[PDB]
Write a protein that binds this ligand. Structure first.
Ligand SMILES: CCC(=O)Nc1cc(Nc2cc(NC3CC3)n3ncc(C#N)c3n2)ccc1C
Length: 327
C-alpha cells in the first residue's frame, strides 16, 4: 500500500465530471482560422507546428493529434481545461478540428524557447533558483488539481530566457491521481523515470514528478545533462544506484514489498551511497551551495513518500534569494 502525502483525495472531493474525462465533450472550433508556418517537432501520436491565427494575427503552437484512442485526446483536453490559468502551465487557447476530416488539434500559446542544451550552459546560480522555483509553481498547481504530469524533462519546460517566462508543456502523458490506483509505469523519458517506474511499482503518485524535477536540478547545478544517463531501463536503475547506493535501494524495495526483476542480479553490483559533494569541480562550483545539495538530497530519494512535495521544495532555503528578490 502507498498513498500520496498531499492532495491524495482531491479528485474524490470534486464533482465526478472533473476527473471523468471519458465523459468530457470538448467544444471543437474551426482549424481553418490557423495558418501553419513551420514544423516544430512530433510525438508518437502528434505533430507540432508554429502557426498564425489569421483572424487576429496571434502566433500559436498547433498540435495535430494523429490516430490515437479518442480517450487519450479527451484526457489531455480535460486536464488542460482543469488547469486553466494555472501558474506557469502552458495556456490552451483553442480546441479545433479540420471541418472535413474531423482530425482534432490543440492550439497553445507560443513561447520563444531557448534550446535547453544551449541554455543550461549559461545559467547562473540565481537563474537556476529562479527557473526551478517557477517550475515548482507549475507542479504544485497541477498536483493541487489532482494531476500528475508524468513527463517532466527539459524538453517539456519551455523557457524564454529573454522575457524570463517558463511554461510546463506536453500534458499528453498526464493523469488524474486516485488513491490506491495502479498506473502504467511506461511513462516519462528514460533519464527522468523515478525508481518506482524502473522497478515496476504501479501505486505511484505526484512524487514521481518530484524525482524528475530533482534530476533536472542535478543536471543544472552539476552541468551533467542528463544527470542519470542509462542506456536502457535496466541500466537506468544501475546509474541511480551507483549514486544513491544499493543498500538504500533494497531498503526501499523491502518497505513496499517490491519484487525486483531478476535480470538486475547480473548488473546492479554493490555501491555505496555517494556524497553529493563528489560531483563538484571547478566547472560547476559556482552553481553549488550547501542549500542546493540539501534540497537535491531531499528530492532524489528512492522512497517516493520521503521526497519533498512541490510546495515543500518551494519553501526550501535554496529559494530564499528568489522570494526576497520578488518582494
Ligand atoms: C503542443 C506541443 C506539445 O505538447 N509537445 C511538443 C512541443 C514541441 N515544441 C514546442 C516549441 C515551442 N517554442 C519553441 C519554438 C520556439 N513551444 N511554445 C509553446 C509550446 C507548447 N505547447 C511549444 N512547443 C515539439 C514537439 C512536441 C511533441
Amino acid at each position: 500500500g502507498s498513498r500520496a502525502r498531499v492532495y491524495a483525495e482531491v479528485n474524490s472531493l470534486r464533482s465526478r465530471e472533473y476527473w471523468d474525462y471519458e465523459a468530457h465533450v470538448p467544444s471543437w472550433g474551426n482549424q481553418d482560422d490557423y495558418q501553419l508556418v513551420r514544423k516544430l517537432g512530433r510525438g508518437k501520436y502528434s505533430e507540432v507546428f508554429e502557426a498564425i491565427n489569421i483572424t487576429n494575427n496571434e502566433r500559436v503552437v498547433v498540435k495535430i493529434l494523429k490516430p490515437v484512442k479518442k480517450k487519450k485526446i479527451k484526457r489531455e483536453v480535460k486536464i488542460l481545461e482543469n488547469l486553466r490559468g494555472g501558474t506557469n502551465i502552458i495556456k490552451l487557447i483553442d480546441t479545433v478540428k479540420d471541418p472535413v476530416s474531423k482530425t482534432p488539434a490543440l492550439v497553445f500559446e507560443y513561447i520563444n524557447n531557448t534550446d535547453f542544451k544551449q541554455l543550461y550552459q549559461i545559467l547562473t546560480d540565481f537563474d537556476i533558483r529562479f527557473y526551478m522555483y517557477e517550475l515548482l509553481k507549475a507542479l504544485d498547481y497541477c498536483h493541487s488539481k489532482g494531476i500528475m504530469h508524468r513527463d517532466v524533462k527539459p524538453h517539456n519546460v519551455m523557457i524564454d530566457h529573454q522575457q524570463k517566462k517558463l511554461r510546463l508543456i506536453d500534458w499528453g502523458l498526464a493523469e488524474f491521481y486516485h488513491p490506491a490506483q495502479e498506473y502504467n509505469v511506461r511513462v516519462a523519458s528514460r533519464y527522468f523515470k523515478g525508481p518506482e517506474l524502473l522497478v515496476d511499482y504501479q501505486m505511484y503518485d505526484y512524487s514521481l514528478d518530484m524525482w524528475s524535477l530533482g534530476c533536472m536540478l542535478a543536471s543544472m547545478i552539476f552541468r551533467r545533462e542528463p544527470f542519470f544517463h542509462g542506456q536502457d531501463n535496466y541500466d537506468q536503475l544501475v546509474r541511480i544506484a551507483k549514486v544513491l547506493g544499493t543498500e538504500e535501494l533494497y531498503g526501499y524495495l523491502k518497505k513496499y514489498h517490491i519484487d525486483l526483476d531478476p535480470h538486475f542480479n547480473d548488473i546492479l553490483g554493490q555501491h555505496s551511497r555517494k556524497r553529493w559533494e563528489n560531483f563538484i569541480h571547478s566547472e560547476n562550483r559556482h552553481l553549488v551551495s550547501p542549500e542546493a545539495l540539501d534540497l537535491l538530497d531531499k528530492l532524489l530519494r528512492y522512497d517516493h513518500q520521503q521526497r519533498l512535495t512541490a510546495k515543500e521544495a518551494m519553501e526550501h532555503p535554496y529559494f530564499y534569494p528568489v522570494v526576497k528578490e520578488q518582494s
